[PDB]
Amino acid sequence: SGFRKMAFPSGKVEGCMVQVTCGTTTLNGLWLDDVVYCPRHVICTSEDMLNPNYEDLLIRKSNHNFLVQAGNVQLRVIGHSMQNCVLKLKVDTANPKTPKYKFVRIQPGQTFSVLACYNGSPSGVYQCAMRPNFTIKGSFLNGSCGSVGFNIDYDCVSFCYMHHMELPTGVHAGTDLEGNFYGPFVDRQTAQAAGTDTTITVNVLAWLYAAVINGDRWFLNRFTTTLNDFNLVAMKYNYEPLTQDHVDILGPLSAQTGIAVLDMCASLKELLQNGMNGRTILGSALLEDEFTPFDVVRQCSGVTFQ
Amino acid sequence: SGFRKMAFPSGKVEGCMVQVTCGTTTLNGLWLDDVVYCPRHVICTSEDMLNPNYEDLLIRKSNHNFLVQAGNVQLRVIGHSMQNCVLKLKVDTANPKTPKYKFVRIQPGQTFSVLACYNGSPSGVYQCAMRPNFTIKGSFLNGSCGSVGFNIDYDCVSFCYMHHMELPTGVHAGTDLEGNFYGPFVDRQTAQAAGTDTTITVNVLAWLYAAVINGDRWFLNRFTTTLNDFNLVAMKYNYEPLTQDHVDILGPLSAQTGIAVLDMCASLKELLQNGMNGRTILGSALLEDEFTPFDVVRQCSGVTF
Ligand SMILES: CC(C)(C)c1ccc(N(C(=O)c2c[nH]cn2)[C@@H](C(=O)NC2CCCCC2)c2cccnc2)cc1
Ligand SMILES: [Cl-]
Numbered sequence A: 001s002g003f004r005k006m007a008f009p010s011g012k013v014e015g016c017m018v019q020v021t022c023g024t025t026t027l028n029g030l031w032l033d034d035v036v037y038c039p040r041h042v043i044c045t046s047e048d049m050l051n052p053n054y055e056d057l058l059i060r061k062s063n064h065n066f067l068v069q070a071g072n073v074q075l076r077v078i079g080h081s082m083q084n085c086v087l088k089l090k091v092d093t094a095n096p097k098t099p100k101y102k103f104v105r106i107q108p109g110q111t112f113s114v115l116a117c118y119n120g121s122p123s124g125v126y127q128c129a130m131r132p133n134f135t136i137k138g139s140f141l142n143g144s145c146g147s148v149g150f151n152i153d154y155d156c157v158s159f160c161y162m163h164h165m166e167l168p169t170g171v172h173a174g175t176d177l178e179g180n181f182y183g184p185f186v187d188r189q190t191a192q193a194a195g196t197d198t199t200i201t202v203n204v205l206a207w208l209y210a211a212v213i214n215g216d217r218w219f220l221n222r223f224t225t226t227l228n229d230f231n232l233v234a235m236k237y238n239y240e241p242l243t244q245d246h247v248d249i250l251g252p253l254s255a256q257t258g259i260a261v262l263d264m265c266a267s268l269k270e271l272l273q274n275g276m277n278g279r280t281i282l283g284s285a286l287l288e289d290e291f292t293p294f295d296v297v298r299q300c301s302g303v304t305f306q
Numbered sequence B: 001s002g003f004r005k006m007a008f009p010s011g012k013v014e015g016c017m018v019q020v021t022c023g024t025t026t027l028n029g030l031w032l033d034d035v036v037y038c039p040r041h042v043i044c045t046s047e048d049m050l051n052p053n054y055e056d057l058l059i060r061k062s063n064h065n066f067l068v069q070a071g072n073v074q075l076r077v078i079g080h081s082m083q084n085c086v087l088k089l090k091v092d093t094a095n096p097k098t099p100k101y102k103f104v105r106i107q108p109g110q111t112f113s114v115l116a117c118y119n120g121s122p123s124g125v126y127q128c129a130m131r132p133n134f135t136i137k138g139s140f141l142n143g144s145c146g147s148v149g150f151n152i153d154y155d156c157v158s159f160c161y162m163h164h165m166e167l168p169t170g171v172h173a174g175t176d177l178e179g180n181f182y183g184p185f186v187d188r189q190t191a192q193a194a195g196t197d198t199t200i201t202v203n204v205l206a207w208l209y210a211a212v213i214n215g216d217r218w219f220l221n222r223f224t225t226t227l228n229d230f231n232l233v234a235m236k237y238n239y240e241p242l243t244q245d246h247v248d249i250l251g252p253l254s255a256q257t258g259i260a261v262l263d264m265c266a267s268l269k270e271l272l273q274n275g276m277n278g279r280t281i282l283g284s285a286l287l288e289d290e291f292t293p294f295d296v297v298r299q300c301s302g303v304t305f
């Protein structure tokens, strides 16, 4: 019993974090096999952060213009290339701690663990979600660039996020490990701003199922809803639309608890209308939307507390 | 910017987790140098658990009653003993991944990271606090016994919790790594319950300072108060008394933000008396009390390990 924001154990990723320095700029890189991945804006000078031409900036660099430090060891850079917004530095030593890994590009609503790092050294681990507006609500200070997000289902590290920058509302933007940004953002100092964000409806429903599994039913009601009437109501509270794909994804949780998906939708509609009247759900006084259906099945018992 | 519930990186601890089996019971152990630590109730049958004589159950046991598995390798047990509620199994191999470490017993209100494990395999990491009633609000399923809690200082892991049991309200109880229970609990199947809990006042103040650092200011006001007057409000709302030592600890945050502890105490007093008026603080509709002052400074300054 209990229910917590639960990250993956971070050791497999800790063994890959290094420090990358170019000029006066230092940030983090990810060392896998004989390649170090980092944000290409490590080659941006202070003079001009507004309109960098990264092709022109990089052709001026020699391999020895990049200093890579793994703990106390300097790694020798022997080649470099740019892929989208990520710089790939070839080094002369393969990382002996390289885990089984893959690169995955995730969809909004998906969650992952973040290992926040400074100067190549890990500071802490937390859970995040890719918001509908393609930002993440991270906790990142100056120098956190190059920190990564990941999942480790079944002993394989799936890297899905590399941190690049902070937006004006204090939320965060970055890329996949192929260097393609999530959302419309660019690695320039522009007036760019996150769009209006929305609540991840399928995740709220998963978390309501988690509450039932852990023994609390107070928020249920005698009603049901059509999918279209649910979406017409939920969107008035700035909730994302619920699709038939989402309904299908919630099937296993519905089967374990005996609560039909559209009956749980009716409960959510009433919670939005009424609030909690001084009660809490899984320790929260707000509706939580950064646990996915997969996350709830991972964390919760397979046996409902009836 | 941003503010998240944040755990320590868990790698140094992952390399110490093993699986311990005695009879039909399997749970987790902590392998440091040539000793594995686990809950002593691993030696109990369900019958034994109703009224166990641990002294007699252990003398019955021998080294060959224990199976220790590190990944796919069996560790050979060459000795066994008990310290309080912790079983110690001497093995023939020192753990080559043993970190610099200490065993530390924490105080109520202090936080720590938990590495939840099953069958000797780490499964997840989360942050939690020792409650004033000496429980923790963990997330644990069957087989999680022997999972540990810890803090890190530079390169040294301070182990502070080993998980033993779940109470009827679904909160959790355990020991320090010397086998001494936190709270008035015993490792036996008998009627036991969490006592009435209170809110950790110094941690709520720390989190209000974190909120100010992150730009959330609507709860600040022109008033100040005194320790004595604030503590009358605290008692009324089942908050822990605020001591002069707590005020000293908050000093830094008070100097940085511009709000004296007693100034911020006046904000908390008003929040307790009037509520939040439909507003949130750092994305919560409740007053959060599982961040210590040290947690707030660490996260807001980027301390690494
Ligand atoms: C060159 C470019 C692309 C404009 C840039 C510059 C600085 C950084 N930031 C580095 O901290 C940093 C950079 N190199 C080492 N550290 C930080 C950052 O985004 N401030 C922004 C301030 C507003 C204008 C855009 C940049 C940062 C802070 C906190 C958390 N995350 C990141 C990120 C990107
Ligand atoms: Cl996805």
Ligand SMILES: [Cl-]
Residues within 6 Å of the ligand: B052, B053, B054, B055
């Ligand atoms: Cl006994």
Ligand code: NA
Residues within 6 Å of the ligand: B032, B033, B034
């Ligand atoms: Na030792």
Ligand code: NA
Residues within 6 Å of the ligand: B220, B221, B222, B223, B224, B263, B264, B266, B267
């Ligand atoms: Na005040």
